[PDB]
From Swiss-Prot:
Disruption phenotype: Mutant mice display flattened nose and a smaller cerebellum. Behaviorally, mice show impaired spatial memory, as well as a marked anxiety phenotype and increased risk aversion. Deletion leads to a significant dissociation of TET1 from chromatin and dysregulation of DNA hydroxymethylation of neuronal genes.
Domain of life: Eukaryota
Oligomeric form and interacting partners: Monomer and component of the SFPQ-NONO complex, which is probably a heterotetramer of two 52 kDa (NONO) and two 100 kDa (SFPQ) subunits. NONO is a component of spliceosome and U5.4/6 snRNP complexes. Interacts with CPNE4 (via VWFA domain). Forms heterodimers with PSPC1; this involves formation of a coiled coil domain by helices from both proteins. Part of complex consisting of SFPQ, NONO and MATR3. Part of a complex consisting of SFPQ, NONO and NR5A1. Part of a complex consisting of SFPQ, NONO and TOP1. Interacts with SPI1 and SPIB. Interacts with RNF43. Interacts with PER1 and PER2.
Tissues expressing the protein: Expressed in liver and suprachiasmatic nuclei, hippocampus and neocortex (at protein level). Expression is strongest in neurons in CA1 and CA3 pyramidal regions and granule cells of the dentate gyrus. Detected in testis and kidney.
Residue ranges of domain RRM in the record: 16-83
Official protein name in the record: Non-POU domain-containing octamer-binding protein
Glycyl lysine isopeptide (Lys-Gly) (interchain with G-Cter in SUMO2) cross-link site: K38, K41, K68
Entry's localization field: Nucleus; Nucleus, Nucleolus; Nucleus speckle; Chromosome
Function recorded in the entry: DNA- and RNA binding protein, involved in several nuclear processes. Binds the conventional octamer sequence in double-stranded DNA. Also binds single-stranded DNA and RNA at a site independent of the duplex site. Involved in pre-mRNA splicing, probably as a heterodimer with SFPQ. Interacts with U5 snRNA, probably by binding to a purine-rich sequence located on the 3' side of U5 snRNA stem 1b. Together with PSPC1, required for the formation of nuclear paraspeckles. The SFPQ-NONO heteromer associated with MATR3 may play a role in nuclear retention of defective RNAs.
Amino acid sequence: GSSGSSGGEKTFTQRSRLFVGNLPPDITEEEMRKLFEKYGKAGEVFIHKDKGFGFIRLETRTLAEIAKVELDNMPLRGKQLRVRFACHSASLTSGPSSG
């Protein structure tokens, strides 16, 4: 269970961490968990008022993607919701040709 106080054995990373901004003053850990009930319970859920932000971390990646676009630009109690990859910041090093 809770082993490795200092560190432990190599574990998975948190690349699937979605950042939620512009959160309403009526948002709680509950609302969040329910908001992402379609993509399963987020591994990590933290909501800060003083700053007005919420960090969510899903298990898989496919979910974060579907929810990243779906939730992205979604109305919440009248307020707006900004969803942007916390770990990934417009970092696309490639050039796929198409047309």
